[PDB]
Design a protein around this ligand. Structure first.
Ligand SMILES: [Zn+2]
Length: 981
């Protein structure tokens, strides 16, 4: 075992230029931590040895911008554009298709940049390690790679210098879209105002109005100052041998450097003498946000950070928390303000609390309630059972097995490590918990004293309020048009000529097919021919309810799911099903009111939820399954309590709870509205697909813009009673055992108790004709009752949702073929091929959009999309040209092999013990069906790819749907084939 092998390392051991400084067992996480330092550079290393085949590498640099140009963000994009050992264009994106990685990305936080990848293949790991090391330490930083990724002046037609110069660039648009999210605007300003003295006062990602101030030389300087191994932290996780990692890191990078003292220290924020307050504005959607925030200690004091994080949870988490009762239940707002709770990304942490959706006349009342709540907590402290619930919640987080543990761990330790803290102390949760408990036993006023010290008597307090401006982005555009004009007018004739020539040069480099034989690569033969079979046992229970049991190493956790059909539900009630689902476990049950119920759920489970699903059939486009998925998890010992809760929720849910219902509705509506820009492409594609299949229509109703708008309507109702009365009607057709199947994932030793607890639940719920005339029994590989609409006819629609956004989100959906159709595998390969070889270049590289690609869903919907796109019309035109390119067959066998690697990267991604058997449980596909599909994927050839392109994607071949979220577009507005919404 990897963790055992690492215990053999001794202090003082020398390995490939590193010295072992510490070896620590962390048995609660089944791992051994090895701390090392590189001898010559002083670079810090942490290896977490654990029996996990999904290994991760990351390198972290302390990056401290002193302006809002976004230099560390733009640098992060640019280092991935070519390096000394791999000078070809775009090593990172190319490696995405030459690898079987489980994760490959890069992130820029406020004061660090982090470069992680993960994979379960050891050769692949070495390959990706060499590319990442070369990119971060020896990057090309070519002027034109920057122009592409950062910002540039470019003629609207690069080969026509009489066309106007405009701003373009990937990060430029990425950040425009990031600050389309009004919570992100608030969150950025909060940090900037609370920590105004140093690096934390600026916009590290890039303020769009500041980006064009960035120069190429500034970009290179920032790299020279921050990207030295003395300024870095190296991290590996998993069961691959440490020695090979150290050998690569030393020989390919660190051996070329000597020790420096980096000029990258982030100094302490000097505490204020008196609180401050500020007001800002932000875009339209009466709706004022206000928060109060407090500066907290240095996160490098790990136990104090741990204590304050838990304290922040006690203060703000759930309907029983003091701030929830005082602020959310007050009905003064819709939801908590952004970044509520503990914020520990910055050298000094901070706590924040407040509300959004408040009428401006209520700001002072909110501020007063915040102060009154603090005084009350100081005086009365916290309920002991809530503290037990929190410690229980942490136990669940400790025991639950995830597939991305390495990524979670490096992200969790990053900020503390950034400021020379000790990441190993962060891993010792058992110690931290025990010390926290001992601190409660020894001082009964421990938490009260902490609240008094950090909240009541703390002068470093910020009140920030934000109010919408209906012309927010318009004013930004006007300022941008202004700055553009100033730059352009300043151009000498030589400058204009340089811009023209370099623009043409960049376009050429973006167009010319290039040799990539530089990069390492796996081969298709490195893909496993078959997959391990999933073992499950289906037992008919409580008569004829099928229950699926899947024994897994869940580490003492039980995962329960029940699926209940929607086939008997009157169709008029369908749009209210998502609302029903969101409040079902939150309104109280039986003798438990909503507060008692929340406490029991927090104390006894890791969560209990219901959600509506539409599950497409594997063989027929116009057949689907519809129902509600009930999902929960708990520790072994709490299983009977969990099922008792499910029994009460199914039998006696509190549908008379009108007050709390209104709170939940307004929270849900607020959250759905806030999340639109971040998921803009998803909303576009859901709309575009809604007229293509019966399932698609239902999905729009459940989770599309229609559902967002319905929730917003409901949240504005003066009398919510007519809605509330629909809930019992829904309960009647759903909360029973008439059309149900369940699943259980647990350890084989926990299985026997679980079968009994599950049987009792099923016997405890109600028992004893589909509203659709055509229902069909589809046996598995459990009879599922599906809806088929044999007279469904797809039709084309084009919808433009007018949004006050500075960028666009575009979706085009095309009806193709279901999973078991042999052409499905070809279309799946084609989606990645088109993304990698056409769409990424046209839409992102040339266009400047943050994202552009194609994908194929299980339902057979082929979707082309863009994300944070400055274009609309040109993007739709590129979709058409992508199809023309596919039909031309102008791609190589190597391009196809790379598309396969990419697809299999996704398809063969690790599945958590809790999620095993879910493919079978939900979609009813057996291992035999998946393996057949896998073989079809392996057999996809060049001739098949051009055939399916012509057969399904060509004009007039299949039905298409289109949707756009974005601002006014004159051309679309004048086209009567477009619906404006
Ligand atoms: Zn970025």
């Amino acid at each position: 075992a990897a963790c055992e092998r690492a215990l053999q390392y001794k202090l003082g051991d020398k390995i490939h230029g590193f010295t072992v400084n510490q070896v620590t067992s962390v048995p609660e996480l089944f791992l051994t931590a090895v701390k090392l330092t590189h001898d010559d550079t002083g670079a810090r290393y942490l290896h977490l040895a654990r029996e996990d085949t999904n290994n991760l590498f990351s390198v972290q640099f302390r990056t401290t911008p002193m302006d809002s140009t976004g230099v560390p963000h733009i640098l992060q994009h640019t280092v991935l554009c070519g390096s000394q050992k791999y000078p070809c264009r775009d090593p990172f994106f190319k490696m995405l298709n030459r690898s079987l990685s489980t994760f490959m990305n890069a992130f820029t936080a406020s004061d660090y940049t982090l470069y992680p990848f993960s994979t379960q293949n050891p050769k692949d790991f070495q390959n990706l390690l060499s590319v990442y090391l070369d990119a971060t330490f020896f990057p090309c930083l070519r002027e034109l790679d920057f122009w592409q990724e950062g910002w540039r002046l470019e003629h609207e037609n690069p080969s026509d210098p009489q066309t106007p110069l405009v701003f373009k660039g990937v990060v430029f648009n990425e950040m425009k879209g990031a600050f389309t999210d009004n919570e992100r605007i608030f969150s950025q300003h909060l940090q900037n105002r609370l920590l105004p003295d140093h690096t934390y006062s600026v916009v590290s990602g890039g303020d769009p109005l500041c980006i064009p101030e960035l120069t190429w030389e500034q970009l290179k300087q920032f790299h020279a100052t921050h990207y030295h191994p003395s300024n870095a932290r190296f991290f590996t996780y998993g069961n691959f041998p440490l020695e090979q990692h150290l050998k690569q890191i030393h020989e390919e990078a660190l051996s070329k450097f000597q020790k420096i003292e980096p000029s990258t220290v982030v100094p302490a924020q000097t505490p204020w003498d008196k609180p401050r307050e500020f007001q800002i504005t932000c875009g339209p959607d009466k709706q004022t946000t206000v928060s109060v925030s407090f500066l907290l200690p240095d996160i490098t004091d790990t136990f104090e950070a741990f204590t304050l994080s838990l304290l922040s949870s006690l203060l703000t988490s759930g309907p029983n928390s003091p701030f929830y009762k005082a602020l959310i239940e007050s009905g003064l707002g819709t939801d908590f303000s952004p970044d509520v709770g503990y914020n520990g990304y910055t050298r000094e942490a901070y706590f924040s609390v407040g509300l959004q959706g408040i009428v401006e006349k209520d700001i002072e009342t909110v501020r007063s309630l915040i102060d009154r709540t603090i005084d009350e907590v100081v005086e009365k402290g916290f309920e002991d059972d809530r503290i037990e619930a929190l410690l229980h919640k942490i136990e669940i987080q400790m025991k639950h097995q995830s597939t991305s543990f390495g990524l979670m761990l490096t992200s969790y330790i990053a900020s503390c490590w950034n400021h020379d803290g000790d990441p190993v102390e962060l891993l010792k949760l058992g110690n931290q918990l025990a010390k926290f408990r001992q601190c409660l036993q020894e001082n009964p006023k421990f938490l009260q004293e902490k609240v008094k010290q950090y909240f009541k008597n703390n002068q470093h307090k910020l009140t920030l309020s934000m109010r919408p401006d209906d012309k927010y982005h318009e004013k930004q555009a006007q300022v941008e048009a202004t700055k553009l004009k100033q730059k352009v007018e300043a151009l000498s004739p030589g400058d204009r000529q340089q811009i023209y020539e370099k623009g043409l040069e960049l376009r050429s480099q973006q167009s010319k097919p290039q040799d990539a034989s530089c990069l390492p690569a796996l081969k298709v033969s490195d893909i496993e021919p078959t997959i391990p079979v999933t073992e499950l046992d289906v037992v008919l229970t409580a008569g004829d309810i099928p229950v699926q049991y899947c024994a897994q190493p869940t580490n003492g956790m039980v995962y329960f799911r029940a699926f209940s059909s929607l086939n008997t539900l009157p169709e008029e009630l369908r749009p209210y099903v998502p609302l029903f689902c969101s409040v079902l476990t939150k309104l109280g049950c039986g003798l438990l009111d909503y507060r008692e119920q929340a406490q029991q759920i927090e104390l006894k489970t890791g969560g209990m939820s219901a959600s509506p699903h539409v599950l497409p059939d594997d063989s027929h486009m116009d057949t689907y399954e519809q129902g509600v998925l009930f999902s929960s998890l708990c520790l072994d010992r709490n299983l009977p309590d969990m099922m008792q809760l499910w029994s009460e929720i199914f039998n006696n849910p509190c549908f008379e709870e009108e007050e709390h219902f209104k709170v939940l509705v307004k929270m849900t509506a607020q959250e759905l509205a806030n999340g639109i820009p971040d998921s803009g492409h998803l909303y576009a594609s859901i709309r575009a697909g809604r007229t293509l299949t019966p399932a698609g229509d239902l999905q729009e109703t459940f989770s599309g813009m229609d559902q967002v708008r319905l929730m917003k309507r409901i949240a504005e109702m003066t009398d919510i009673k007519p809605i509330l009365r629909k809930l019992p009607r829904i309960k009647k057709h759903l909360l029973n055992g008439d059309n149900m199947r369940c699943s259980v994932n647990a350890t084989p030793q926990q299985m026997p108790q679980t079968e009994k607890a599950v049987e009792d639940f099923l016997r405890s719920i109600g028992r004893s004709r589909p509203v659709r005339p055509h229902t069909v029994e589809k046996p598995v590989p459990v009879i599922r009752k599906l809806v088929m609409e044999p007279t469904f006819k797809p039709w084309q629609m084009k919808t433009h949702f007018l949004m006050p956004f500075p960028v666009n989100y575009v979706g085009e959906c095309i009806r193709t073929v279901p999973y078991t159709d042999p052409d499905h595998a070809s279309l799946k390969i084609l989606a990645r091929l088109m993304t990698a070889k056409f769409l990424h270049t046209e839409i992102r590289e040339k266009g400047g959009a943050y994202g552009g690609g194609a994908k194929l869903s299980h339902n057979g919907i082929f979707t082309l999309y863009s994300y944070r796109d400055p274009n609309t019309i040109e993007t739709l035109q590129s979709f058409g040209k992508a199809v023309d390119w596919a039909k031309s067959g102008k791609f190589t066998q190597q391009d196809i092999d790379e598309a396969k690697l990419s697809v299999f990267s996704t398809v063969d991604a690790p599945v958590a013990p809790s999620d095993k058997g879910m493919d079978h449980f939900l979609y009813g596909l057996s291992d035999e069906m998946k393996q057949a599909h896998r073989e079809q994927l392996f057999a996809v050839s060049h001739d098949k790819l051009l055939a399916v392109s012509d057969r399904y994607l060509g004009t007039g071949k299949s039905t298409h749907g289109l949707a756009i979220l974005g601002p006014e577009n004159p051309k679309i507005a004048k086209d009567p084939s477009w619906i404006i919404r």
